[PDB]
Amino acid sequence: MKFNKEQQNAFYEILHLPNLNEEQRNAFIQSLKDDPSQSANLLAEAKKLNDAQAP
C-alpha cells in the first residue's frame, strides 16, 4: 500500500513497549503521525525511555 515500512514499524514497537505510560506512548505516536521522517529517532527515543522506566 505504498506505505512507509519504517514508520509502521516504529508505530508497532512503540505500541508494545511495556514500560511507557499512555501519555508518553500517545505522544510518540502523534509525533510519528506528524513527521514520518523522524521515525528512527522517535523509536530510539522511546526505547531508551522504556528501558529507563524498567523495574
Partner: protein
C-alpha cells in the same frame, strides 16, 4: 412511528492497524422522520465525552425517510487497547435518547499463518485462473487481505468472510483472478495480510509459476 434506530459501526480493521491510515467509528441513525429531523450526537470514549466528531448533512432515503451519519476519528492504540466508544443520539422528540457502545473483540490474540496456493492443474484449461491465499489461526476475526503485483495493487480479487474454526481461531480464503497468460509469463503475485497479532501488523506471501 416507533422512533428512529441507531447503528454503530467499528473502524475498518486495516485503518486501526496501519498508522498511515485514519480509523473512524461511524454512528448511523435510520428511521428519522421528515417531521423531527434535527438529530444531535454525543460521543464518549470510556465514558468521557469527546468533541471532534463530524456530522454528515441529512440525506433522503428510498422510503421517504431520512438518514443521518456522525463520524468519530479515533486513535489506533485506543481501539486496539479495548476502549469503549459510545454514540448517544438525541431529539427534542425522542422519549429517551438512544445509546450504543462498541469495542474490539476481547480475547487472546492469535497470529495467522499465511499460505499461497497456485491454480489447480484442472483450471489451467481456462482463460482465467485462481490464485488462492489461505489465512488460518488468527484471532480476533478483524483482518484485512490485499493482493498486489510488481509493486502495484491487483483488484480483481474477493475474500471470504472470516470463518470460525474447530479451535476457536478464525480462517479465511482470498481468491485472486488473473489471466492465465500473466501467470504463464512468470508474473509474481503477493498476498498481503494485516492483523494485530502480526509483527508490524503486516506480513506478505508471494506466488508465481515455479518448480514443484
Amino acid at each position: 412511528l416507533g422512533g428512529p434506530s441507531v447503528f454503530l459501526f467499528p473502524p475498518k480493521p486495516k485503518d486501526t492497524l496501519m498508522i498511515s491510515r485514519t480509523p473512524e467509528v461511524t454512528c448511523v441513525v435510520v428511521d428519522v422522520s421528515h417531521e423531527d429531523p434535527e438529530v444531535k450526537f454525543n460521543w464518549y470514549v470510556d465514558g468521557v465525552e469527546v468533541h471532534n466528531a463530524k456530522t454528515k448533512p441529512r440525506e433522503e432515503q428510498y422510503n421517504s425517510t431520512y438518514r443521518v451519519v456522525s463520524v468519530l476519528t479515533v486513535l489506533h492504540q485506543d481501539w486496539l487497547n479495548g476502549k469503549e466508544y459510545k454514540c448517544k443520539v438525541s431529539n427534542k422528540a425522542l422519549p429517551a435518547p438512544i445509546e450504543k457502545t462498541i469495542s474490539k473483540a476481547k480475547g487472546q490474540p492469535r497470529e495467522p499463518q499465511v499460505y499461497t496456493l497456485p491454480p489447480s492443474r484442472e483450471e489451467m484449461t481456462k482463460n482465467q485462473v485462481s490464485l488462492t491465499c489461505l489465512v488460518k489461526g488468527f484471532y480476533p476475526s478483524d483482518i484485512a487481505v490485499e493482493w498486489e503485483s510488481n509493486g502495484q495493487p491487483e483488484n480483481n480479487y474477493k475474500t471470504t468472510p472470516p470463518v470460525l474454526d474447530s479451535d476457536g481461531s478464525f480462517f479465511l480464503y482470498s481468491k485472486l483472478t488473473v489471466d492465465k497468460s500473466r501467470w504463464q509469463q512468470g508474473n509474481v503475485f503477493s498476498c498481503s495480510v494485516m492483523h494485530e497479532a502480526l509483527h508490524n501488523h503486516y506480513t506478505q506471501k508471494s506466488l508465481s509459476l515455479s518448480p514443484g
